[PDB]
Amino acid sequence: VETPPEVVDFMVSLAEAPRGGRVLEPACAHGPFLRAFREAHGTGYRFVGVEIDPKALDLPPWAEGILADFLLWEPGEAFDLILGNPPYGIVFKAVKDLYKKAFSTWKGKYNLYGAFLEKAVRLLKPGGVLVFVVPATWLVLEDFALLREFLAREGKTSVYYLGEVFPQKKVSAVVIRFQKSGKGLSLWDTQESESGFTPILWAEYPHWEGEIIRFETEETRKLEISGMPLGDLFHIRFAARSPEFKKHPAVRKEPGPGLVPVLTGRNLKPGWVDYEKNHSGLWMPKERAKELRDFYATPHLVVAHTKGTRVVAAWDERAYPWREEFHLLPKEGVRLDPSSLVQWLNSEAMQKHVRTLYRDFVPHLTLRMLERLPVRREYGFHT
């Protein structure tokens, strides 16, 4: 992770503060952003840094270092600019309750970076600016819904997609520039070069109010317009998990005649299901799978969520028991042609659609992404 030089250079170039203003860097350690800003915008500012570990707090004489928990810190002042790279993650857990209590945007397991964002927006004076480098997950995940509403409600938000720029991959980063005055959302793309990053305005949402953020285009919109949402034709169910199966008196750890393998994502292929190979080590009489989840008795559509931001669909003609993935059951009055549907879902046009929109924000297809995939007119419809 850390914060690459070019990224830091990028964030400081979006940073702005009135001469004499207070500049703050949460979880600063040695103050990388504080130093970079000074070396770029000058010295006529009041510098402050908040760090929780005495062994990490190492700031220059011109900066006021404060040893505290940013989340629990309550200064008697507001700031003009807040720069930083907040902690990414979860988790003497009286502190956890303390966080929940103090943070309104807190939902589910959440993530500390979300808490740092809310706190930061609150220590901001009117017109104040905040610049943070965080994961892209808050763009589409349901746990960040309250946060997106919070930001939309509080001011103007600019999101700059950076992608996987940290040493450790599988963490797509995004720079968020927030100003506590106004409203709207501007989505920006960036081009990496020998010189660093170059911003490219993608699209603006003046009436943004917390809705999921996606990279839309003309093709994206046409496809979604000329088709019905998958979430309108199907009931998206989830499979039972191992404990449940390991708790069923009929489930065996070894094969046998009459015993059927509990399928997993490695059995689901693009367009077909490999009913043979066992990947769970659990076997059970097919007939009794209905006792875990009713839909297990019905041949239906299976879409993967363990294969990244990719749509992999297959029709479970035999109706075998599954340990995971998305399970789609048709709604009452919906008639459809399974073969054409599957072909459609696994198509190159569908992959591009999903990839254009959600890039690598998350390492998998979510319900929300799933339920709004467009099904073509002549496959499935309502009677």
Ligand X SMILES: Nc1ncnc2c1ncn2[C@@H]1O[C@H](C[C@@H](N)CC[C@H](N)C(=O)O)[C@@H](O)[C@H]1O
Residues annotated as catalytic are: 85-86, 88, 166
Q: How far is the CB of 30 from ligand X (least distance, A)?
A: 8
Strand partners, 234: 330
Q: How far is the CB of 288 from ligand X (least distance, A)?
A: 46
The nearer residue to ligand X, 30 or 279, going by C-beta atoms, is: 30
The nearer residue to ligand X, 57 or 341, going by C-beta atoms, is: 57
Q: Is 254 in the site for ligand X (CB under 6 A)?
A: no
Q: Find out whether 175 and 11 touch, Cβ atoms under 8 Å.
A: yes
The nearer residue to ligand X, 51 or 118, going by C-beta atoms, is: 51
The nearer residue to ligand X, 111 or 278, going by C-beta atoms, is: 111
Give the integer Cα–Cα distance in Å for 66 and 59.
Answer: 10
Q: Is 1 in the site for ligand X (CB under 6 A)?
A: yes
Q: Find out whether 51 and 27 touch, Cβ atoms under 8 Å.
A: yes
Number of residues that bind ligand X (CB under 6 A): 14
Q: Find out whether 34 and 131 touch, Cβ atoms under 8 Å.
A: no
Q: How far is the CB of 308 from ligand X (least distance, A)?
A: 22
Closest CA to 347 of 378, 374, 365: 374
Q: How far is the CB of 253 from ligand X (least distance, A)?
A: 40
The nearer residue to ligand X, 22 or 248, going by C-beta atoms, is: 22
Strand partners, 39: none
Tokens found for residue 297: 């008795």
The nearer residue to ligand X, 1 or 201, going by C-beta atoms, is: 1
Q: Is 27 in the site for ligand X (CB under 6 A)?
A: yes
The nearer residue to ligand X, 111 or 186, going by C-beta atoms, is: 111
Annotated binding-site residue? 69: yes
Q: How far is the CB of 218 from ligand X (least distance, A)?
A: 35
Give the integer Cα–Cα distance in Å for 239 and 226.
Answer: 31
Q: Is 87 in the site for ligand X (CB under 6 A)?
A: yes
Q: How far is the CB of 33 from ligand X (least distance, A)?
A: 9
Q: How far is the CB of 12 from ligand X (least distance, A)?
A: 16
Give the integer Cα–Cα distance in Å for 347 and 12.
Answer: 42
Annotated binding-site residue? 17: no
Annotated binding-site residue? 3: yes
Region of 182 please: left (phi>0), alpha (psi -120 to 50) or beta.
Answer: left
- One-letter amino acid identity for 328? L
Query: Under 8 Å CB-to-CB from 241, ≥6 apart: which residues?
Result: 323, 324
Annotated binding-site residue? 25: yes
Of positions 4, 16, 21, 29, contacts ligand X by CB under 6 A: 29
Distances (CA, A) of 136 to 38, 160, 263, 319: 28, 10, 31, 37
Q: Find out whether 198 and 212 touch, Cβ atoms under 8 Å.
A: no
Q: What are phi and psi of 99, to 5 degrees?
A: -60, -55
- One-letter amino acid identity for 17? A
H or E stretch at 283:
strand 283-284
Name the segment binding ligand X (CB under 6 A); options: 81-89, 174-182, 253-261, 362-370: 81-89
Annotated binding-site residue? 27: yes
Strand partners, 316: 300
Question: What track of x and - describes contact with ligand X for positions 32 through 71 (by CB under 6 A)?
Answer: ------------------xxxx--x------------xxx
Q: Find out whether 16 and 81 touch, Cβ atoms under 8 Å.
A: yes
Question: Which 3 state secondary structure label does DSSP give 258?
Answer: coil
Closest CA to 330 of 197, 233, 230: 233
Q: Is 88 in the site for ligand X (CB under 6 A)?
A: yes
Q: Find out whether 59 and 26 touch, Cβ atoms under 8 Å.
A: no
Q: Can you give the binding site for ligand X, defined by CB under 6 A?
A: 1, 27, 29, 50-53, 56, 69-71, 85, 87-88
**Can you say which residues are annotated as belonging to the binding site for S-adenosyl-L-methionine?**
3, 25-28, 51, 69, 87
What residue numbers does the annotated binding site cover? 3, 25-28, 51, 69, 87
